[PDB]
Amino acid sequence: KQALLEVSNLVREFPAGESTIQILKGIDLTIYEGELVAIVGQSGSGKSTLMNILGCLDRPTSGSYKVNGQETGKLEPDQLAQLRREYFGFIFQRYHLLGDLSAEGNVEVPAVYAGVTPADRKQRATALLTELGLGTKTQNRPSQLSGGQQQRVSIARALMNGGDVILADEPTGALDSHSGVEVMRILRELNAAGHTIILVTHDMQVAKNATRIIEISDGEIISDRPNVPDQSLEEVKSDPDAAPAAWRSTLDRLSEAFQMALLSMNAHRMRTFLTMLGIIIGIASVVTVVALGNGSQQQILSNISSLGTNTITVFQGRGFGDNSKTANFKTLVPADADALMTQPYVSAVSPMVSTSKTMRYQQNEANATINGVSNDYFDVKGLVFKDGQTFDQRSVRDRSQDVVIDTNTQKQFFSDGTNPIGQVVLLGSVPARIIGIVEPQTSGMGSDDTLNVYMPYTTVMSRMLGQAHVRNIVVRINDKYSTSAAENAIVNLLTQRHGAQDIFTMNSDSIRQTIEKTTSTMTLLVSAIAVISLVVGGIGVMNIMLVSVTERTQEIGVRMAVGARQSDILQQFLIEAILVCLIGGVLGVLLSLGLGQLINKFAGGNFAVAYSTTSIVAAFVCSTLIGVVFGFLPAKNAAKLDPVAALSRE
Amino acid sequence: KQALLEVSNLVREFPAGESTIQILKGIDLTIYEGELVAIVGQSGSGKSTLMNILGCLDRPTSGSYKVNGQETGKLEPDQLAQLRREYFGFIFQRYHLLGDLSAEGNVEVPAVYAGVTPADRKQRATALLTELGLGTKTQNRPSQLSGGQQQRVSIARALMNGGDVILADEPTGALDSHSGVEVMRILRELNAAGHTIILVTHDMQVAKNATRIIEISDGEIISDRPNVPDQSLEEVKSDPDAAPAAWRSTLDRLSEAFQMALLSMNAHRMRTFLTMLGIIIGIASVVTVVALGNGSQQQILSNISSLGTNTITVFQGRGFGDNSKTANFKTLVPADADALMTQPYVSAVSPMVSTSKTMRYQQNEANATINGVSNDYFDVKGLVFKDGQTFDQRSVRDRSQDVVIDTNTQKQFFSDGTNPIGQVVLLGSVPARIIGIVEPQTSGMGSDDTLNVYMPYTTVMSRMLGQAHVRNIVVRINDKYSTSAAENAIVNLLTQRHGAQDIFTMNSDSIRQTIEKTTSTMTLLVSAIAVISLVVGGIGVMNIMLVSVTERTQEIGVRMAVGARQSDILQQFLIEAILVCLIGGVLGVLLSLGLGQLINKFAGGNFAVAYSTTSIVAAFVCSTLIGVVFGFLPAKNAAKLDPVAALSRE
């Protein structure tokens, strides 16, 4: 028949100085189930390398080691991990425990990396910890336990997956005489229950506890020989301790990884909040700058929407410097607008003049801008009437005091819901009857904020201003038929009619396009100086995750020796980085929101901030990608660690 | 007389569960110089607490401990540090060494904090390491040494400041039988030389190496008693080992802190380059943005530097057409300039007209801008003549073909060094003789470009263009009067002289002023989106330093135990952060430079980058301040650690 542990011709060469050295010189050994073995030797003998190979933490590399008939010489890390989970459990001199978890958690870890019900492993965990006398200390964390207590914890952990072969590296080397007697007694009782126990030690008095003492020096076994410890008379073995034993599952273990990362974040908070804080600052700056640019383009377009579509406007210079030069040198007259009206390219034309007067309705008064306009004006500027009607050509000609108001004026005087149409307000000293209401241009506030009122320009000029000239003339170019050449033919036409070239011309579509270009581009470059430099300046996640790997290299080694797959470590650290970046992106979004509603307070009427709902989705996605990226290299470096070198590193 | 170590009724309490517990009950001890003492007890007895107090790492809270007649009960941390450096040296179970330093360095550390010459301490370090058999291993790092070898290193370290009282925790607890005999024999040999040695242990077989065995349980000494070890005959001495005992020094401690921070940086490289890298990106982005803005303001001012200082320009005209229906409406005539000349506010006036023609000198062809101007023109635009003279009022009147050239045209045709004055080139079909050379408006060597040439405006209008009108008229404002009132009187004046308001005017000083305002504030905002978001988003230095304090807590404890002052730890980590920020702030400056010389290629004439030499100084200063700010909190957290808790944390 075949023994459990079958060692044939193990040669382990570790290279040193462009040459190889044999730490194991061709050892043959056979250990059957249930046997109590102490491998004893001095430092450099090869005892601990031999144990590493026995524990499937290392390969022969020349020879054969068969665990229950399975050769490990060619096996790959996850296969050796399988053998660890099924057959082996470990105990170390300094009794490595996870400072984050508790006793029950440390005990659970091996069950976690195997397939286990989270309820069931709580049952076995608390059960084993109770058998070993820690029942009251179940919830204690390693910093809260003594040396002996921690070593008993790691015993329970080794027994979680059944402890078929328990490998103890100098288990009493760290702790005192009493807890040493207890650890040794617990092991001997476990062997009495049938556990194969192999303890490696440099102390002969320690090796006395075994029934079989193998002695190793300079990579060869010099002695192996039966032994009966004398304390078997001391301990009659009264109180019995017997405790022997790609679709689907990656969901389950990935969930486990989520709680591993989550509780590890909860353990270390301050560092989570700082690394996360960089990303909060980053996403906040990104969304703040992008949304500020979007809202400022939107604002300055709706603020300049006072022009309209396909509208060429015609101005004058000053012509002042005296009040005689007013009636002299102001040459733009409504006759010019009438002339423009008969042109083939003009769909609509209006003159315009304005004055500020006190608008009174009943007891309420206010200050309003009164705009003398043609009845065509609402067509050219593109205003749509909420309720009423415009004037007529008849009413423009007859100097009607019919008046049109905008939504803001309705809000001012008629807040009662009383229909303003038909109501007679007074503008200055001139009464007016409201024939219509207009919904204005702007999206948000803007600069208006101002009460607009429209009367026929004839009535404003004659009844109010007392002037023969027009402030400016707006035209809607029909068909968009040579929209630029219309402006040119307009200046040619009025320059003929005037004595000289008296008139400035302003193209609305070109002004809008220029504003959109400049705002869009500068929002792009400023937002790049935010995004690229900041979020890319959030590499610190990578750095802190690298230092988190170097920190936990022992934790990683213990995880692997307890049966962690490389995939399991990688998923743990990727899920940690991903989760930190995701949550810190959510807080970056919220900081950007509240910060933006703060920036709406500031005096800029040109500055507004508009949050694109597809820049928020892009924010979450990009933050999570920062997690998956930086973010990656440490999560892979951890899973690629050598569990031997990882376990012994300090 | 009084013995070295005098303990009288020391009671050491710790709070447990909202109540106090006595770990040390009233203990009396007297240890004279030269005694070999083993304090032996089990875990919880109070033995290691008693040692901590003996080592001046902790205070009794009840009672007295006098080191050579000096009560430590009320002493402050730097005072206890003094006593450590003067009297004590330490040895720990796991033989704590600094993985960064070598054997010689670890041995030096106590001498380092004791104010010793690096030459002298190198001698004593190598001497002690040779005495203990490490002479060949002198340069090895702890990772390169065996357990016994490392413990021998820490022995030499304890002997550095003289090892009057050597306090050993379990010295053999980590290491095997042979190296145990070696370490323990070395101790007995040191006591033979007169070293007071106190070794605390949980193992009686270890305690028997001492001549005096004190035994302690539940905070009291149950036994104290002489002992003669049997190994005194087994150890015969063939090699007696006897090695017993203003403005200045703060600069020394800063030098040491600089050296060790530097070597620690050299130890961990990837961490350093990543931590820096954020600040390299940050400083690069700030200096790039500010220098881009300064250079773009520099260009957009030099692009509008085609105007003068205190220079009002007068334009007109848009549409094409006939000689009748267009040229009749061109009202700018040199007569307008003559009228302006007699005004009190006008220092100089020139009209201006331009045409592009092919300039030929000998075999060279080129294309030049030909500017009809008044002889006053160089006065108003502020051009200075490199060599020759301007025209005369007679030559302007007489349609002279005398011509003035700028530096660029000289560079083109006369690159032979041939004096251009007197030479006859031809402009188009019109020959001209050069009477003068002008140094242009350029700020920088990329602004100027095109070849300017100036003839009297009369000659250009009549001989070339065939037009009666002037493209525009430039006016320099005398008295340095109000340029706005100048515009007002100019527009009134030419508006009266013309039929109507025919003329547009540009104020040069106001345009320049506006460009400077908007560019400056704009770049301040964008550079704030760099700095505020980036360098402040470079908190990660603080985080890495903070976890670097965590990882080094044992290193910090050992340093304090060898005599480190809190100030010394503070200087170490604060100087580390400072150097991390400064180095890489310089690399951020260099990255910004190279990026700027990249942007000088790929960018147009509006984008240029000009690096202010007072923005680089500000870069170094600000980076170092980021060090002194963010690095501080960790550097303080390290210096405030309890050496007891720091040593036993893991």
Numbering used by the authors:
A (entry chain B), B (entry chain A): 3 to 247, 260 to 664
What does the literature reporting this entry say, word for word?
The envelope of Gram-negative pathogens, such as Acinetobacter baumannii and Pseudomonas aeruginosa, contains unique tripartite machineries that export noxious compounds from the cell. MacA-MacB-TolC contains similar components as the relatively well-characterized tripartite RND transporters AcrA-AcrB-TolC in E. coli and MexA-MexB-OprM in P. aeruginosa. However, the ABC protein MacB is unrelated to AcrB and MexB, which form large trimeric complexes in the plasma membrane, raising questions about the structure and domain organization of MacB in the tripartite efflux pump. Here, we present the crystal structure of MacB, and show that, by analogy to RND transporters, the MacB homodimer contains two large periplasmic domains (PLDs) that enable the interactions with the other components in this tripartite efflux pump.
MacB was purified and its crystal structure was solved at 3.4-Å resolution. A non-critical polypeptide segment between position 248 and 259 at the exterior of the NBD was found to be disordered. Two MacB monomers have a biological twofold rotation axis at the centre of the dimer. Each monomer in the dimer has essentially an identical structure (~1.1-Å RMSD in Cα position), and has elongated TMs (TM1 and TM2) protruding about 25 Å at the periplasmic side of the phospholipid bilayer. The interface between the monomers in the MacB dimer is extensive (2188.9 Å2) with major contributions from the TMDs (1053.0 Å2, 48%), PLDs (676.1 Å2, 31%) and NBDs (417.0 Å2, 19%). The TMD of MacB encompasses four TMs per monomer, which is the smallest number among currently characterized ABC exporters. The TMs are not swapped between the half-transporters and lack the helical extensions into intracellular domains as found in most type-I ABC exporters. Even though the MacB monomer has only one cytoplasmic loop, MacB preserves two CHs as observed in other ABC exporters. CH1 is present in the intracellular loop between TM2 and TM3, whereas CH2 is located in the carboxy terminus of MacB. Unlike Sav1866 and MsbA, in which CH1 contacts the NBDs of respective monomers and CH2 interacts with the NBD of the opposite monomer exclusively, the two CHs in MacB only contact one NBD within the same monomer.
